[PDB]
Structures are given as structure tokens and as C-alpha cells.
Symmetry: C7
Subunit: 70 residues, 7 copies
């Protein structure tokens, strides 16, 4: 709907999304949940730098978000 | 309406807009949705300085927005 | 009314105003609309050419508005 | 009343005040209106960045305010 | 009451307090009023490092406050 | 539930979590409580900037939170 | 209660706590009051940086708080 841009997050549940953060971080992961604050829960998340690190479950606070690429 | 500046986003649904962000980024895309926080959903979005990177769907958190060119 | 400072924008609708932003930008343009957040819609706007038919400015960026 | 600090602005309506801003600016002008966000309307406003432009009418966003000298 | 920290401000009404600001300023003055945002009204306010800068009445926006010394 | 990202915190009650803060700090501890602001009470908590002290109870203010690793 | 993290502050009333602020300050004193914004009233407070200044009663604005150590 033209007035609910966060509904696009719902269409991406159980896919990999890229959450860009204000501080320049890129957080990629499997979107498990999101709310109207754009808080999100990401499964098996990875931070673009530094790499190698692995996050079974990551809850990202919405206010840190720049944009989400679905 | 002189009291509803965001109604101008409603008249630009499915057009190309440029969202200027507080950090200097320019995001161009087709406006699919917006809410009263100025969250916007941009289809086939593009950010300058990174040309050939393209985002099929970018959900932009309103609090990062400087202004929106319609 | 001494308690409605934003009514000054209502009296400036369809006139040229200058929006000063927190970053030092001066956005000039014709005021079409505003809200209690101080979001504004500016018609035929400039940032001192590069011109914008319609620019919707988010209120939390505003320093002050010259009417 | 001791629970209403912004009533001091009410006692200074139509007098000259100095609005100190977070960024170090000082704005002087005659106080025509204020609200509970500390938004203020200033007539014949001068900013000490230049002492020759008298803005007929300046509306200052309250969240930029450090303090107001009455 | 142990759930109303700002009631301590109430016990300092019409006495001298020091308001520490986020940016490192100290503002001293006689507390006339305060609200739940920690906006405060100060009579005969002085800033510590500007000895001669005197203010008959200063209204301080509370979101600049670090803490208040009573 | 796909609309309740913070329920992942409720499942992590009485387990060890890592709270990443906006300033780069990492706070690690046993999660006893959280709220919809992402305030969290952490028992026997450790700062990686000091991984020797074991604070009996740390209440972290959620507005500082970048993401929590669960 | 697992959804009331600030209740831990209520358990610490009239004991000595240490409030960590975002600017790196540590404020120690006896907790007399708190509220849901994490404003706190600290009696006979001390700041680690300047351990010679007494603060008989300090009201600290919650938005400056990093975490409280109980
Ligand atoms: Ca267009
Ligand atoms: Ca808004
Ligand atoms: Ca306020
Ligand atoms: Ca405002
Ligand atoms: Ca203690």
C-alpha cells in the first residue's frame, strides 16, 4: 500500500536482507522479524567489516538504521 | 492542503524522486510508499558516487532525510 | 496568538521564504505547506542554476525560517 | 508557578530577548509567540553573525535552543 | 518519593543551584521553576567562565542538561 | 512472531548476551529483564574494555544500543 | 519481573550506585530517586575525574546515562 513502506519488510521475512547502519556498518542476515520502529531480528548475521565474525541471532535497534535493502 | 506538506509525496507515488540524506547521500528511485515519519520505499534505487550498484527495493528510515525532491 | 509561533508560516503561505538548515544550507522557495513538525513544502526552490520544482524539507533539519 | 518555567516567556511577550542556540549563535529580536516545544517567533531578528540584516520575522525551531535570556 | 527525582528540584525553589550543560557550561542562578522536561527558569543567572555575563532571567531548555547541583 | 523482534530477548532471559553500544563498547552479561525501549538489566556483567570486573548488576539504557547478540 | 529492568533501581534505593554517562564521566552517590526516563537523584555524589568537589544532591538527566552499576 502507498502509505505503508514497512510492509515491504514483511514481504522479505525469511530472506536475506542488508541493513545499512548510520555508522557505515553493513549488516546482512535472514530477516526474522521487524517492528514499526524498524527494529529487526536477523538470523545468522554478518558484518561486512570486520568479517569472519558470526551472529546466530542479532536484534538491531531501529534508530541506527540508514536504509534496508531487500 | 496548506497543513499537509507530506501530501506532496502522495502526488509523486510511482514517479522518480531524489531523497537527499543528512550525510550527503543522494538516493534516486521510484517512490512506492511513504508514511508520516517520512520513511520511504524506493524501487530500483540508486545512490550517487556508487553508480553500478543498484537496489531493487530500498526502505529508507525517515529520520535520515534532509529533503525530498519531487 | 502569542502561543502559536507556527501561525507565522500560515501567514506566509504562497510567499517566498528562506529555510535555514542545521548544516548551514539556505533553502529559498515558495511556501506551499507546513505542519507542526515544521516539515515544509517549497515550490521552485533553490539552494544558493540548480532548481527544484517541489522540495519537501523534513522539519528536524530546520534551524530557523525567515518569512 | 514553580512547575511552569516557560511562563517566563509569556511575561516577556513583545519585549526584546536573546535566544542562544546550541551551535553558538545568538539571535535577538522581539518575542511575538512561543509554544511548549520552545519554538519562538521573533520580530526584527538579528544574528550576531551579521549586524545589518534585520529579518522582519524569524521562526526558530525550539530544539536548537540552548537557553533564552529575557 | 523514590520515583520522583525531580521533586528534589522542588525543594530548591528560590535558592541558588548550578545547572551543568552537555557542552561543559556551568549555569548558576536562583531556581524559580522547572518542568518534567527539566526545563528550568533561573533568576540572576551567571555562566562560570564568563564572570561578567549576568542574566536577569534565563530559561534553559532541559535537553541541554547534564545534571543539576542542588 | 514476525512483528515482534524483541521477543527474541524474552527467549534469552537468564542466558548470556552481548550488548553492542553506539560508542564501540561491548557489555556482556546475564539478561534478567528488558523493556520495549531495549533497556536491559544485566547480571554479573563485563565490559570488554575492562574484562576483569564483574559488575553484580548493570542497567543499560536502550538508546545507547547498536545491536544485541543472542 | 523480566519486563521491568528499572525495577532493579528500586531495589538499590538508598544504596551507593555508580552512574556512567555518555561523556565518560562516572558519578557515584547514594540513589534517592529514579523515574522511567532514568533521571536519578544522587545524594552526596562524587565524580571520579574531580574527586574533591562535593555534590550534596545531584539530579542527573537520564538521556545522558550509559549504564548504572548497582
Ligand atoms: Ca520526479
Ligand atoms: Ca516528521
Ligand atoms: Ca522540551
Ligand atoms: Ca519542535
Ligand atoms: Ca552498591
Amino acid at each position: 500500500d502507498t502509505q505503508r513502506p514497512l510492509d515491504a519488510l514483511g514481504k522479505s521475512i525469511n530472506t536475506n536482507v542488508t541493513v545499512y547502519l548510520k555508522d557505515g556498518k553493513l549488516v546482512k542476515g535472514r530477516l526474522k522479524a521487524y517492528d514499526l520502529h524498524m527494529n529487526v531480528a536477523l538470523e545468522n548475521a554478518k558484518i561486512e567489516s570486520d568479517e569472519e565474525k558470526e551472529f546466530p541471532m542479532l536484534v538491531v535497534r531501529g534508530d541506527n538504521v540508514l536504509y534496508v535493502s531487500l
